[PDB]
Design a binder for this molecule. Structure first.
Ligand SMILES: Nc1ncnc2c1ncn2[C@@H]1O[C@H](COP(=O)(O)OP(=O)(O)O)[C@@H](O)[C@H]1O
Lengths: 580, 88, 100, 100, 111, 111, 97, 99, 81
DNA sequence: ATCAAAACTGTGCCGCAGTCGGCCGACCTGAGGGTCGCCGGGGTCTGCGGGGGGACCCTCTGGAAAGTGAAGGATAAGTGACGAGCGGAGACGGGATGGCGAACAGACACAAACACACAAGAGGTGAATGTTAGGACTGTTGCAGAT
DNA sequence: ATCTGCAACAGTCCTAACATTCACCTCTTGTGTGTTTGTGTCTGTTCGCCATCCCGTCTCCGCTCGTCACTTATCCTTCACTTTCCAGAGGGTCCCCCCGCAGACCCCGGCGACCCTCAGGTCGGCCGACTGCGGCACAGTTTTGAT
């Protein structure tokens, strides 16, 4: 039991923030309770839970802690943040110096909200040329400013500018880049200057790794270093199925809730707006083929059991063959692609089974990816069979990026399968007009979930979202899936923690904690190719059922040749044991 | 469809015309013909081939896969091209 | 000559004459060309063993083995000479080790 | 103010003075690294490098190309010219020993 | 006891592996000297000597001679490109040069 | 009882390089079988002379350039301006060094 | 991890520098260059004295072989002064202690 | 008889015969007096083995033949036929021996 | 022994140039090649007399010339070792 | 033979890596003190071969004279490299995400050095034994230079 | 198209430079058995590099184009080079002398290798930390390109 010891830490050094200009104690020792907004907030009303979060953060200011707003996508962090800014401007009369930090893909939107909702506060931006930066440099060295927008990058690139000013209150956004304790931006913010009041803002909990520590337990509070430098793994000791994780460390999980009481706020999207209907998630099992089978399972033997770090290449053997392009010089060296040469990957056979019926039934489709060469060769097929599409990646040059949404959100947008990348876009897609979001390869994260779903899960998703998370039989893609999904739904505990770390229904912290521990104890239950089932898990209603059976009749009266290619022969011996 | 990797600027021609001109104007040259570029690029290619095959041989003898500073310095030392600075 | 022990100095001369009678059954060699082949054999010996000495001190061994002489071959000899020299050396050391 | 263009040669001479006056690296690091890794891929397919290995190769190759252009400048000036051509890069390497 | 097996006879060579082993032993190259290393080195040396003598004997065949002279070794060496690369800084005594004339110095074909 | 474990062999000859380390490197470097007791003193004094000559000539190159810290450009200028140091380091490329301010006489236009 | 001592002539180059220029410091990479220079000339003089030992059919590297190695390696005036420095120090070493 | 060859014919036939032959080309006794003078600069009472003098002669004549090959290349490069002191200096500078 | 360098006769230098492949020679080659030959012999003979003065002999030998040539860079085959 | 137009060059200030001085940790290497194989060095002898002188003989250098043919200077048509401007664009920072390989510490059987025994292979001589390149001595065609 | 002059072949001819035996001496290399230490094997830690993508921020590289200083082809003159011949002279060869001297033994002490302690000089992270120094900023020469 060390929660009271950290309470003693904060009780001892809770006086620094008020001299230098129990946890139920530290969040409730001072109170001021005004549900009314500050007077100069213009351009729309507040929701009541927005006022709740605002009042909580005003108490965070008055408890003089370092708070965290961490609710879900599409629930208004921006208006709450500028409401905090204007309440702290007028109703406390300290008038800055305020700093903010956003990603550059949202700085126009944040400056728009700074114009519409606080015209009394003058807002300096930082973008563009060194000419514009030099003009605003000469403007800011005198001290005539209220709000200083800047990105991630100009913190280090204007070190001297934003260090010679004694800062008061920064509020930085998108904290899952602020996570890394050896990020150079994090080192410059820590050895920057003693800026007083700092807030992370995020839409996600801990991801990718171990619990929350390296962002919120470390950067947001410096005294937790002095109280954590040996006990970090001691709290992280929960990190095999019933006895350790479920039975005896349920108290440890409750102690993690108990230490993360006064600092977070993750109100779920299901509570108040709930305009997202649902998320109909299924999984679909692809397989190998005549090269990806014992042909390439020979190459696991005659390579290891050559290319370096084959775990990366074992993704490529189950995504698509001849992305190496050396075996294209043996299977189709005539450099002309056709039927049953591109199609030989089993994922791709599943594509040209499933895609013509959603072409018929009219499902608008987003498709995400890693490995942009898979996007390229899918685009090569997508010009081969000639069905309509687009493509977006890390080579859109920001103008076609801001352009392409008008092409895809037309009422006559005949382009249907909008090819994407899982990384590409940076929370700026804003696309409600799809109803089928398939996924090729699972990442090393649930950020693929928590972004690529939310691209279509925005305000205005007026269908049911049918997700087809592909997988292949006994490849590395399954250990990617079970690895990331199981041991990175650690935040099943934290997504349960959201409601009683929010508005706090009192039965959430025991009863529905157990009801989601049900999903954490159906591990072995959940761990353990037919047109009927696969065509129903995409189906929605019965006219779709009649036309999918009609398309089955229409490709059954046509005599399908066969499914795909068989194992031709001498090139199978040639690709493996004659390379070198 | 550009699906091959045939369409990309090749890596030896990535040693640019203005970088060849900066090594020339450091060398002392006042005026440079137009075939110097191909010739100097061929010269650099052959010299790197000699030094990197010696460094690969030293590395493979030491039974590792990481070509190091001392391996390149020993290779230049037996090229006759002795280098100070990196071999302590 | 009255007995004063003409001092023995060794060479490679009978061995070069053996190899010449292998690769050409009917050709004599001159005395000065015998001395050139002798100085050549000493030169190539001293180059290869000097490079194996440097590899021994680099890798902090203290022992010249078949692998250090193989790597000295791959350093000193060019191209196809290095290839056939490595082939001859490995053939002779396996015929040494296996047979007796 | 547009008709102020220097006599051809003058910018070349101030380039000569600045680049001999300074001591940085002149070929840029990323494409020279990709060239080094390509040429190494022609020998051992699965290598790894080091930042100091690539910087050692870059110091060596830039000092080599500067010495080659000093000697080719001497050969071009000997031929009563100013413009260096390929025939005297080949002459500098033939005389120096690196060609034949 | 056996009668005798020379180590050269075991390996099938011609050069003296015993003499090679004592030269590697006390030429101060390293302290310990392995037991397969003189066999490998004598093999390398027998190869290089056989190569040189084969090319010199072919040149002496070409000049109707049956005695191999330093001119013949010079011609073999500087006419084989790889032996020329190995023996680049080497003056074979009583050599002469390769018989070579430049192409400018030939007389005018029209006159 | 040890008499007086002091006065390292560097201190007896009055040198500034380690005679002990030089003797150990000559001894286990396997240059020869055995090493006299005066040869590393002689060698260490020689290496003191050479380091002293280059560092003096580089001190007088980091005075013209108004700079009290010897960077490699200064070692390049000292070495390649002393003609005997240039002949000792003739094949050597001092890294991060740069070349000398040499512009040929026929290049710079004056007439 | 038992931090491995990799030794060099850094502090000795520094002593000589503070003798001949008392108010000058040396950069880090120039110290690496002076280190590599001392190791280079060490290997050359020791290699030539080893060659002299094998050429005379004699087993011992002595001061005579180091003196002839210095006269065979160094140019001219550097050779004459370095041989003078070495003989100076060897007579001071043999006479005093 | 006016049977005088034009220059070029006798030059090419001396090229042919002196590349086909193999003997030494500097006279043995004046070369020996040269060597003994130069060595008399360095030591007073030396004695020369005849193989030492002939080794010096082989080395010097292979040196001068290789140097004149590089001077012939430089002279052809300068659009000439005549070798000159400026290109002897050129090959001894590009090679390394002088500067 | 006064000015023995002119014992290198003018047709001797012309013969070495004919072996070298020189078709036509200047008239100032002669003093220049005598200077070149004298520099090369001063270097080789300085190194070989250093080997001999070390060996406590009073005789230049074939091995001393060979060792001087080898440490200069010019290896010489045919005079023993 | 004077002024516009750029380009270095001082000064000077201001943060920033980065020398650098202790701090002692904390060793791991050098100094000292003993022992004892062993190698180098002083000393004698003795063939041996390099310096030197001289006789003779002849090929090879020195020197001059005549023709001439490349070296070099002047000239002009031709074109290719250089300076400058402008707009994409790839180097360059920084990040995400695992994963592996190399440097660094104990235990240990191959393996290489030691050291005797001994014979047999390899130098030194010699002596026919040929023999094979070398050296004049002439027959005989292929390149060269006015016809 | 025909004299003509070196130069490559065609077949003897002393001689000398290798190649066979030969016994033979000796030293040197296998053969075989105690033995010890250098090299490898696996277990754990840490940190830097690899295969993939991202996301900005820029100097800087590529392309166009105008314009002219260069490279090169032609021609003319002229002097420095080759070719030939011919008188002489030193280089080459033989031979003889004749002592300095290189090398081989011989013997005996100094001396360096090895070993065993044991104190402290050297590395080396921290711990600031002082400052020497690059990067902006502002006046002020200082050459170049017209004129
Ligand atoms: N009281 C309100 N009335 C209308 N719209 C609101 C209100 N509060 C918030 N919003 C909406 O919230 C949006 C901003 O939300 P944002 O901060 O982007 O949420 P998230 O950060 O979760 O994506 C605005 O576009 C605005 O339309």
């Amino acid at each position: 039991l060390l929660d009271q010891t950290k309470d003693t830490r904060i009780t001892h050094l809770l006086r620094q923030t008020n001299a230098f200009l129990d946890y139920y104690n530290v969040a409730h020792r001072i109170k001021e309770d005004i549900k009314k907004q500050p007077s100069i907030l213009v351009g729309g009303t507040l929701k009541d839970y927005q006022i709740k979060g605002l009042q909580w953060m005003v108490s965070l200011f008055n408890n003089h802690l370092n708070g965290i707003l961490a609710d879900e996508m599409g629930l208004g962090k921006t208006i709450q943040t500028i409401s905090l800014l204007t309440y702290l401007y007028e109703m406390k009369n300290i008038r800055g110096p305020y700093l903010v930090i956003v990603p550059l893909s949202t700085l126009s939107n944040w400056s728009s909200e700074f114009a519409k909702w606080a015209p009394t506060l003058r807002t300096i931006s930082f973008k563009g040329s060194p000419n514009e930066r030099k003009a605003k440099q000469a403007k800011i060295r005198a001290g005539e400013f209220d709000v200083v927008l800047t990105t991630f990058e100009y913190i280090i690139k204007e070190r001297a500018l934003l260090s010679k000013v004694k800062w008061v209150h920064m509020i930085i956004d998108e904290g899952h880049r602020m996570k890394n304790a050896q990020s150079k931006l994090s080192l410059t913010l820590n050895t920057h200057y003693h800026a007083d009041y700092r807030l992370i803002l995020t839409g996600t909990p801990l991801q990718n790794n171990l619990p929350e520590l390296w962002a919120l337990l470390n950067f947001v509070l410096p005294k937790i270093f002095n109280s954590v430098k040996s006990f970090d793994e001691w709290f992280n000791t929960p990190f095999d199925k019933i006895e350790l994780s479920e039975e005896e460390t349920l108290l440890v999980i409750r102690r993690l809730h108990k230490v993360l009481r006064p600092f977070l706020l993750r109100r779920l999207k299901k509570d108040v707006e709930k305009e997202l209907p649902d998320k109909v998630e299924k999984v679909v099992k692809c397989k190998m083929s005549a090269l990806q089978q014992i042909m390439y399972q020979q190459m696991l033997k005659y390579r290891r059991l050559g290319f370096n770090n084959q775990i990366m290449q074992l993704k490529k053997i189950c995504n698509h063959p001849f992305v190496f392009e050396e075996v294209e010089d043996q299977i189709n060296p005539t450099r002309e692609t056709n039927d049953d040469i591109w199609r030989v990957a089993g994922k791709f056979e599943l594509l040209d089974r499933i895609l013509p019926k959603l072409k018929a039934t009219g499902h608008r489709v987003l498709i995400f990816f890693q490995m942009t060469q898979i996007m390229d060769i899918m685009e090569d097929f997508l010009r081969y069979i000639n069905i309509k599409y687009l493509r977006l990646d890390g080579h859109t040059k920001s103008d076609e990026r801001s352009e392409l949404l008008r092409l895809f959100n037309a009422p006559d947008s005949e382009y249907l399968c909008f090819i994407l990348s899982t990384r590409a876009g940076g929370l700026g897609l804003n696309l409600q007009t799809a109803d089928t979001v398939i996924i090729f390869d699972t990442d090393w994260n649930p950020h693929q979930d928590l972004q690529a779903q939310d691209r279509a899960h925005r305000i205005g998703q007026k269908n049911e979202v049918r997700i087809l998370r592909l997988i292949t039989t006994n490849s590395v893609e399954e250990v990617i899936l079970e690895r990331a999904y199981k041991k990175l739904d650690i935040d099943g505990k934290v997504i349960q923690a959201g409601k009683f770390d929010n508005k706090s229904t009192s039965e959430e912290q025991e009863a529905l904690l157990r009801s989601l521990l049900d999903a954490e104890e159906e591990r072995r239950k959940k761990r353990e190719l037919k047109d009927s089932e696969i065509n129903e898990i995409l189906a929605r209603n019965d006219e779709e059922m009649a036309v999918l059976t009609r398309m089955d009749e229409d490709r059954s009266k046509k005599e399908e040749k066969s499914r795909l290619l068989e194992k031709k022969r001498e090139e199978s011996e040639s690709a493996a044991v004659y390379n070198g | 469809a550009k699906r091959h990797r045939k369409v990309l600027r090749d890596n030896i021609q990535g040693i640019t015309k203005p970088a060849i001109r900066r090594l020339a104007r450091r060398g002392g040259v006042k005026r440079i013909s137009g075939l110097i570029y191909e010739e100097t690029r061929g010269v650099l290619k052959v010299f790197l081939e000699n030094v990197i095959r010696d460094a690969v041989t030293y590395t493979e003898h030491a039974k590792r896969k990481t070509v190091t500073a001392m391996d390149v310095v020993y290779a230049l030392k037996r090229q006759g091209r002795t280098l100070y600075g990196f071999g302590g | 000559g009255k007995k004063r022990r003409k001092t023995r100095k060794e060479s490679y001369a009978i061995y070069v004459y053996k190899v010449l009678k292998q690769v050409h059954p009917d050709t004599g060699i001159s005395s000065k060309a015998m001395s050139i082949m002798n100085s050549f054999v000493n030169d190539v010996f001293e180059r290869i063993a000097g490079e194996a000495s440097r590899l021994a001190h680099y890798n902090k061994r203290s022992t010249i083995t078949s692998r250090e002489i193989q790597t000295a071959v791959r350093l000193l000899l060019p191209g196809e000479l290095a290839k056939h020299a490595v082939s001859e050396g490995t053939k002779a050391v396996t015929k040494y080790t296996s047979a007796k | 103010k547009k008709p102020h263009r220097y006599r051809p040669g003058t910018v070349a001479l101030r380039e000569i003075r600045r680049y001999q006056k300074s001591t940085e690296l002149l070929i840029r690091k990323l494409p020279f690294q990709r060239l080094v890794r390509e040429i190494a891929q022609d020998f051992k397919t699965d290598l790894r490098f080091q930042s100091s290995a690539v910087m050692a190769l870059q110091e060596a190759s830039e000092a080599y190309l500067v010495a080659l252009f000093e000697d080719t400048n001497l050969a071009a000036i000997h031929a009563k010219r100013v413009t260096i051509m390929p025939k005297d890069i080949q002459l500098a390497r033939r005389i120096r020993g690196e060609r034949a | 006891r056996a009668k005798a097996k020379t180590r050269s006879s075991r390996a099938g060579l011609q050069f003296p592996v015993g003499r090679v082993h004592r030269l590697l032993r006390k030429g101060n190259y390293a302290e310990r000297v392995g037991a397969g290393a003189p066999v490998y080195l004598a093999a390398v040396l027998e190869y290089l000597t056989a190569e040189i003598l084969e090319l010199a004997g072919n040149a002496a065949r070409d000049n109707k001679k049956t005695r191999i002279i330093p001119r013949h070794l010079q011609l073999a060496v500087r006419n084989d490109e790889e032996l020329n690369k190995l023996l680049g800084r080497v003056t074979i005594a009583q050599g002469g040069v390769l018989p070579n004339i430049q192409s400018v110095l030939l007389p005018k074909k029209t006159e």
